C-alpha cells in the first residue's frame, strides 16, 4: 500500500536492487522488509549494502 | 546481459512495487526474477500487473 511507501522508501528500494553482488532472492528480501517496515529503510538498505560488499570481490 | 540497469529496467521495478492489490509474497517473486533476468523486466511486469488486477476489487 502506498500509505506505507511513497518515494523516500522507493529510493532505498532501488538502491537495494542496484546491488550486483546480491541476487534476486537476497534483494527481494530487503525490498519486502522495506515496504513492510519503511521505518528501518536505512537499516534495511544498510544490511543490503553489508551483504553486497560482503560477497563483493574486494 | 544488461546489468547496467537501463531505463525500462528501473521503471519495471517501481511499477512492480506500486501494485497495491499485489502482496509482498508475489512482488518478491517478480523482483527475484527481475534481477536474475532483467530481460523479463517487461514480462514479469505484465505478469505482476495481471496479478494485481486478479486480486483487484469490484
UniProtKB/Swiss-Prot annotation, chain B:
Residue ranges of Immunoglobulin-binding region B repeats: 2-58
Residues annotated as transmembrane: none
Domain of life: Bacteria
Localisation per UniProt entry: Secreted, Cell wall
Biotechnology: Important immunodiagnostic reagent because of its ability to bind the Fab and Fc fragments of a wide range of mammalian immunoglobulins.
Entry remark concerning the domains of this protein: Each of the immunoglobulin-binding region repeats can bind the Fc region of an immunoglobulin.
Complex formation: Interacts with host TNFRSF1A; this interaction leads to the stimulation of both surface expression and shedding of TNFRSF1A.
Job of this protein: Plays a role in the inhibition of the host innate and adaptive immune responses. Possesses five immunoglobulin-binding domains that capture both the fragment crystallizable region (Fc region) and the Fab region (part of Ig that identifies antigen) of immunoglobulins. In turn, Staphylococcus aureus is protected from phagocytic killing via inhibition of Ig Fc region. In addition, the host elicited B-cell response is prevented due to a decrease of antibody-secreting cell proliferation that enter the bone marrow, thereby decreasing long-term antibody production.
Record-stated family: Belongs to the immunoglobulin-binding protein SpA family.
Name of protein: Immunoglobulin G-binding protein A
Organism: Staphylococcus aureus
Residues of the full protein shown: 213 to 269 of 508
